Amino acid sequence: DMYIERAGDITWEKDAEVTGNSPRLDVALDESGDFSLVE
Amino acid sequence: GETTDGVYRVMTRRLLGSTQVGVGVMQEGVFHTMWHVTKGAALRSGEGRLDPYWGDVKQDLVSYCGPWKLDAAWDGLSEVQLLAVPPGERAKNIQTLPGIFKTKDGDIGAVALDYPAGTSGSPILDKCGRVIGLYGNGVVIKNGSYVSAITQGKRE
Ligand SMILES: NCc1cc(Cl)cc(C(=O)Nc2cccc(-c3nn[nH]n3)c2)c1
Numbered sequence: 001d002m003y004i005e006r007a008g009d010i011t012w013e014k015d016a017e018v019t020g021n022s023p024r025l026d027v028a029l030d031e032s033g034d035f036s037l038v039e
Numbered sequence: 040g041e042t043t044d045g046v047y048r049v050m051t052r053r054l055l056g057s058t059q060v061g062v063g064v065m066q067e068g069v070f071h072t073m074w075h076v077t078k079g080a081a082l083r084s085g086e087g088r089l090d091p092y093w094g095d096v097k098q099d100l101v102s103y104c105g106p107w108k109l110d111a112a113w114d115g116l117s118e119v120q121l122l123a124v125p126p127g128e129r130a131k132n133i134q135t136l137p138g139i140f141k142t143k144d145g146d147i148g149a150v151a152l153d154y155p156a157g158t159s160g161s162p163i164l165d166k167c168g169r170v171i172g173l174y175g176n177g178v179v180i181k182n183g184s185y186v187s188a189i190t191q192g193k194r195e
Contacts, residue, residue, distance in 0.1 A: 002082050004083070008045055008046050010044070010045055010046055010064065012164055018118070018134040022137060025141065027178060028143070029097070029144075036178060
């Protein structure tokens with residue numbers, strides 16, 4: 001039995017930690033909602 | 040139940056202790072999460088019940104109490120923020136420039152940030168604070184790292 005609990009407001013934080021790259025990937029999406037890489 | 044707008048953890052007591060299986064967004068009286076988090080099951084909010092209203096396995100999305108309300112889209116140029124809500128940890132904003140998923144049916148924004156599976160459903164926001172999609176359905180690339188699509192529904 002699943003339940004929900006509030007965790008916060010949805011707001012943009014000024015000067016938040018900035019990280020992660022921006023990869024451009026060729027992908028396929030199947031009928032089960034799973035993404036896979038196309039090579 | 041609590042119906043105030045915001046980000047919420049999705050928990051279960053079926054396993055050992057209380058386990059966080061995902062996250063979602065309450066907006067305009069509707070709870071939004073990824074299908075793989077709930078598998079379309081009903082949810083509890085205090086003494087109240089939330090019943091599924093719309094869902095689709097291929098999009099990996101589900102809404103409760105009403106139709107999908109989130110319609111903001113990534114502009115294709117700007118940095119965004121993942122409001123990550125990791126299991127047992129405080130909500131935290133992470134800024135990033137999305138990459139792209141190129142598909143036969145069009146391009147989708149993607150965020151190359153790696154969090155535990157129980158973070159699925161955390162919202163990705165634009166600079167106006169609008170939810171442009173949910174984090175948690177993606178791929179594992181040739182370095183073991185994780186890249187999630189920016190998954191957004193359609194507002195009828
Ligand atoms: N640590 C990387 C990571 C982060 C996040 Cl936020 C999510 C995942 C992940 O596994 N997502 C996913 C997608 C689609 C189906 C399922 C699933 N199906 N059934 N039970 N889970 C699970 C992985």
